[PDB]
Design a protein around this nucleic acid. Sequence first.
DNA 1: TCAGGATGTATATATCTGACACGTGCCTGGAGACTAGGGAGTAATCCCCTTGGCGGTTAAAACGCGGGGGACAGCGCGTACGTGCGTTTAAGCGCCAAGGGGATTACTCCCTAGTCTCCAGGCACGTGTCAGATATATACATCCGAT
Length: 232
Amino acid sequence: DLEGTTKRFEHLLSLSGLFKHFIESKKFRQVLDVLEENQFRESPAYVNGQLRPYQIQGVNWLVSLHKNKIAGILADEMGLGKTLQTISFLGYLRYIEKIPGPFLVIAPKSTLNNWLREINRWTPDVNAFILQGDKEERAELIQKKLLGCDFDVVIASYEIIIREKSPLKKINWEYIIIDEAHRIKNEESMLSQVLREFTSRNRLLITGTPLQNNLHELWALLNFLLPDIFSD
DNA sequence: TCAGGATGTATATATCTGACACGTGCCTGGAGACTAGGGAGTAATCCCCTTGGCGGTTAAAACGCGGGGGACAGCGCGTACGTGCGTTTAAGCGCCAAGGGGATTACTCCCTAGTCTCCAGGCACGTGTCAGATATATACATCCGAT
Ligand SMILES: Nc1ncnc2c1ncn2[C@@H]1O[C@H](COP(=O)(O)OP(=O)(O)O)[C@@H](O)[C@H]1O
Ligand SMILES: [Mg+2]
């Protein structure tokens, strides 16, 4: 809790810590009152295939954010290969960090199967167990796989996560990802409301249009990744 | 009948969200004079209602009979509902956008009500009447039960 909570603070102050408004105003005041006195440049191929030069630093940015243990949103534009740049990071955890699964692949219904198609083409031998279908084929799939604790990559749609919450609510998670995250722009939206209760270390959000309506929507995205940091 | 199905029916678990308990203040109910007018009690007058009995007229009501036709029981029968299975289709559920509608919440005034003060003139009551609605009779024309 506080070991990461404190460490993130001066790390924000470390890399251009020019905030000086909410880093100190934020009940974390007494927590920081204690301290108030004071890399894959080779297009690596652990995941199969070659990575074009401008795609790597994004992964290292994810790696650096992971190595610093803070969540981050990427804002690659449409058609730029966010799919590859997403699964590559998970390969980093599986290969370099040796932490395979569990993770979610919360995505639109249209792209449910699409990522799995792209998942295998750069990283075969993966545990992708998409949860989709009628009331039945989903149901028995819960016990054998979701309740079997034998997965690393879980694919489920916006509508699914609001249905199969009770299984996934029990399961602890490391990371949770949402593609085309802008549907989380109303912080009282029931899907956004449900995701508050999902236990995870950090979260990843993929978007191309973070700011669409106001600047108030950005904080709702920020309230999701780092609720402690912004919280208002 | 009995075994084959299909259908409620108890039962344990996990979820949750709705009922309940708790602190604040502000607003309303309570204490306490002060007063006036509604209502309780009284007296007087007159019309209606009671209880028990009597006498009379005269239509309705009670009773019996006979005969028809309407009811209720059966017998087909041929639909028109049921039951079941497959498959679309729409209800419901989320989400996006911007407004207007509305309900407090808080001052201001205008004006339009209530209150009083006379004072005439509407209206209710007690008097005639005569015109409309009776009851009478009769001729008729108009349905109903047998050829
Ligand atoms: N380094 C690469 N080499 C070859 N193809 C790539 C590379 N990076 C991305 N792609 C392809 O470009 C496509 C871009 O898709 P993307 O925009 O990530 O989809 P989405 O918008 O649904 O996330 C992907 O389907 C992927 O196959
Ligand atoms: Mg995409």
